[PDB]
Write a protein that binds this ligand. Structure first.
Ligand code: SF4
Ligand code: SF4
Ligand code: FCO
Ligand code: F3S
Ligand SMILES: [Mg+2]
Ligand code: NI
Lengths: 544, 262
């Protein structure tokens, strides 16, 4: 059974490490299970305030700095947002280039998240020192495709490297790790810890290649610089040699995804099947991504190859269309002036007002985005359920492969385990589509290299840019007046997932996912981290 | 086993783009750097410990007998006694101040920690400041948004092995920030010939003309971008887009509008 203490009392985890940004989590525990929770964002920067009165063309450069982990996505959302406000339809090549760069971002983002942010919640690195490299090799051979990196020689070299490190006494980033000295919530045998650690180290090199691929089209990573109002500026990104190099790098990354990421994910999920019954929520929203027609937000929602939709009460039989008019943000439990509740983003207000730490009536710098009164989970799991429910062929195949491997029903995906698996699932699907997407653009760019359209700044207008970033549904909302920014509002995936309670006192997805979390050791609450990390929190994003 | 120099890395008002930049290093790769060269003793983005355990890891590193070097990412929000930016229930300004007091050296990675950065742009609602601006201490600045990992790792390695490198007036190492972007730009001949793109959709843009008229800040920006590239493959002007001047102090207010000339 799942290890669980008898602990009753409060637990605060601040800082939450291995996320982007500054998060404080508070929980109340009763007999070893979480009974109440608060998600408290600890930094405010105020990009929305800073943008007022500025040139709309400048928006993307400021908003990109909402986040350096999900780099690019905010530049994209801002460009879509402004493109919509000035009523310009970008050329086919720009749509293709923009979507490829997003694809590249998914690959980089998910890989790094699983290995460098999430894995340490399930993998005991020091236990890898106890493994026999030969037995670990033999294991890796049965649970994953053959590769020289999984040989006894390669695994022993990793182990020796790790041993020299631990024996030095300078544990660095492993100092005071929750797994040191063993921990009941860590289930993996030493051989699997060794395999996961070896891949952890390989992933550090692989992420460099994933970023290079992205930079071929995006100019640089982090913080791309190739998008303009009306399309893209990167004519070179349409030519033969850079696209050949992009494809080569992408295939290297996709090989790592299929040889290491997916097998590690499945191996881990196999040991932690109990986590298929922990951390579930009920509502899912996605704006979709990889549209074949990005001429407008309505077209984006309708033509996204990763479909948009809204699921409520876990009902996979009723995927509704996204109503952009039904989105609003509450501030009742947030550090903003009371009275800003129920604002649709076109009328958004950002008036910071701090109180104090652990004030249960105002406890976060994130607003609380709600959809028709309901908290919505966004991200890989949302996209996966939505696509699965709509019978999207790739998702249907890859989900059923996972459910079969684990021998669990689809309802098991409503959990922290499912949330982690979904992230791998869509990485595999992005990978499966790269060659086709690249070829489409290579051929298109060879024939006609139009990349940017002509446009004009209106005196007064509004627009919305939608994207499904790696963490979920992202939207930028602009009001233009006197040819300047009059209002600019970001509603970001982490705002949906990790924001505080709404005006009704209703918990956010992460707050609700935490209820029922078993705590094996109140001194070292890894289980809180498992669920929180599964949402892939980005607090710079959520707060902006 | 040789003792590795202790590095404490703090995150303040930042987007984590600088941390991400740092891990794109290939000379050496990040694993080789933290296993062989330094002891990265606190780094919130990647460290295993969380909460009180992470806070004790920091206190341990600050009390280490051999001392430590301090890397600071992000600006410092100063409004409301620093309470709009908190870690472990302490204001970021307070923790950065303590950590700085005893550091062997201080490296500011990124325009935000060096000069205030994006949260400092008008009207600066959190009253954000650069590290040097808020604490009154000399820092080695590695600016850019984010800086090239070549510049950061180069500086870190230089500081541990050779001492403080020669710095310009903005506290930037001349090794990396000694030359204007523009002076090494492959489009310089177009600039010298008055061959400018009037728009991004123009035939001039397609032919790779100079981007000066589209707002390129290369002529007033100190950085090594065209010389070393990013991710071993590209830089913004090669990607057809003007330089924003992202390594210059307060560029958010001095280089905007981005698509216009000063
Ligand atoms: S300097 Fe730029 S990339 Fe670095 S933390 Fe600041 S905004 Fe992010
Ligand atoms: S593109 Fe920019 S840096 Fe290059 S020559 Fe022209 S103005 Fe100078
Ligand atoms: N992915 C991502 Fe960042 C968040 N949350 C955005 O958008
Ligand atoms: S925008 Fe920054 S990245 Fe180099 S090219 Fe200009 S200094
Ligand atoms: Mg917002
Ligand atoms: Ni982000």
């Amino acid at each position: 059974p799942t290890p669980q203490s008898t602990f009753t009392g409060p637990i605060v985890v601040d800082p939450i490490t291995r996320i982007e940004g500054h998060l404080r989590i508070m929980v109340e525990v009763e007999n070893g299970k979480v009974k109440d929770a608060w998600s408290s964002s600890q930094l405010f920067r105020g990009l929305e305030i800073i943008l007022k009165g500025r040139d709309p063309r400048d928006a993307q450069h400021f908003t990109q700095r909402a986040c350096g982990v999900c780099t690019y996505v905010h530049a994209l959302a801002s460009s879509r947002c402004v493109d919509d406000a000035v009523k310009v339809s970008i050329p086919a090549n720009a749509r293709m280039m923009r979507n490829l760069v997003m694809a590249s971002q998914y690959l980089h983002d998910h890989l790094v998240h699983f290995y460098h942010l999430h894995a340490l919640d399930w993998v005991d690195v020091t236990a890898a020192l106890k493994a026999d490299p030969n037995k670990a090799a033999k294991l890796a051979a049965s649970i994953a495709p053959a590769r020289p990196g999984n040989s006894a020689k390669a695994l022993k070299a990793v182990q020796d490297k790790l041993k020299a490190f631990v024996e030095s006494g300078q544990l660095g980033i492993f100092t005071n790790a929750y797994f040191l000295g063993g921990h009941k919530a860590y289930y993996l045998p030493p051989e699997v810890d060794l395999i996961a650690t070896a891949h952890y180290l390989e992933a550090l090199h692989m992420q460099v290649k994933a970023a290079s691929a992205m930079a071929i089209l995006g100019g640089k990573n982090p913080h791309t610089q190739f998008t303009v109002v009306g399309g893209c500026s990167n004519y070179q990104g349409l030519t033969k040699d850079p696209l050949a190099n992009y494809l080569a790098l992408s295939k290297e990354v996709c090989q790592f995804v299929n040889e290491c990421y997916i097998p590690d994910l499945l191996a881990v999920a196999g040991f932690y099947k109990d986590w298929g019954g922990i951390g579930g929520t009920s509502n899912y929203l996605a704006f979709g991504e990889f549209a074949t027609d990005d001429s407008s937000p309505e077209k984006h929602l309708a033509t996204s190859q990763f479909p948009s939709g809204v699921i409520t009460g876990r009902d996979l039989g009723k995927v509704d269309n996204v109503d952009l008019g039904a989105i609003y943000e509450d501030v009742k439990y947030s550090w903003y002036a009371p009275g800003g509740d129920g604002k649709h983003p076109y009328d958004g207000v950002t008036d910071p007002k701090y109180t104090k730490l652990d004030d249960k009536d105002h406890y976060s710098w994130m607003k609380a985005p709600r959809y028709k009164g309901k908290a919505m989970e966004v991200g890989p799991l949302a996209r996966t359920f939505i696509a699965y429910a709509k019978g999207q062929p790739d998702f249907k195949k890859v989900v059923d492969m996972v459910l079969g491997k684990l021998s669990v029903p689809a309802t098991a995906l409503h959990s922290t385990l499912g949330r982690t698996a979904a992230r791998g699932i869509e990485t595999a699907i992005v990978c499966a589509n790269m060659e086709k997407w690249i070829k489409e653009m290579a051929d298109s760019g060879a024939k006609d290299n139009t990349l940017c359209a002509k446009w004009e700044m209106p005196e007064e207008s509004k627009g919305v840019g939608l994207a499904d970033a790696p963490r979920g549904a992202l939207s930028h909302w602009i009001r233009i007046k006197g040819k300047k920014i009059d209002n600019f509002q970001l509603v970001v995936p982490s705002t949906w997932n990790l924001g505080p309670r709404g005006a009704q006192g209703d918990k956010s997805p992460v707050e609700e996912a935490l209820i029922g979390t078993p705590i094996a050791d109140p001194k070292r609450p890894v289980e809180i981290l498992r669920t929180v990390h599964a949402f892939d929190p980005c607090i710079a994003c959520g707060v902006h | 086993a040789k003792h590795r120099p202790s590095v404490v890395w703090l995150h303040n008002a930042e987007c984590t783009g600088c941390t991400e930049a740092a891990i794109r290093t290939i000379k050496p790769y990040i694993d080789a750097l933290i296993l062989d060269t330094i002891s990265l003793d606190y780094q919130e983005t990647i460290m295993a410990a969380a909460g009180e355990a992470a806070e004790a890891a920091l206190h341990q590193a600050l009390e280490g007998k051999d001392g430590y070097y301090l890397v600071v990412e992000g600006g410092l929000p100063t409004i409301d006694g620093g309470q709009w930016g908190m870690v472990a229930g302490h204001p970021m300004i307070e923790t950065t101040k303590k950590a700085a007091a005893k550091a062997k050296g201080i490296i500011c990675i990124g325009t935000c920690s060096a000069y205030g950065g994006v949260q400092k742009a008008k009207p600066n609602p959190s009253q954000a400041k650069g590290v040097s601006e808020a604490l009154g201490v000399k820092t080695i600045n590695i600016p850019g948004c984010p800086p090239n990992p070549i510049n950061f790792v180069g500086a870190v390695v230089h500081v541990l092995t050779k001492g403080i490198p020669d710095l310009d007036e903005n506290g930037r190492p001349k090794l990396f920030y000694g030359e204007l972007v523009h002076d090494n730009c492959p489009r310089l001949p177009h600039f010298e010939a008055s061959e400018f793109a009037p728009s991004f959709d123009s035939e001039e843009a397609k032919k790779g003309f100079c981007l000066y008229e589209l707002g390129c800040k290369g002529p007033v920006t100190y950085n090594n971008c065209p010389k070393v590239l990013f991710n071993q493959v590209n830089w913004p002007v090669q990607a057809g887009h003007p330089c924003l001047g992202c390594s210059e102090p307060d560029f958010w207010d001095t280089m905007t509008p981005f698509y216009e000339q000063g």
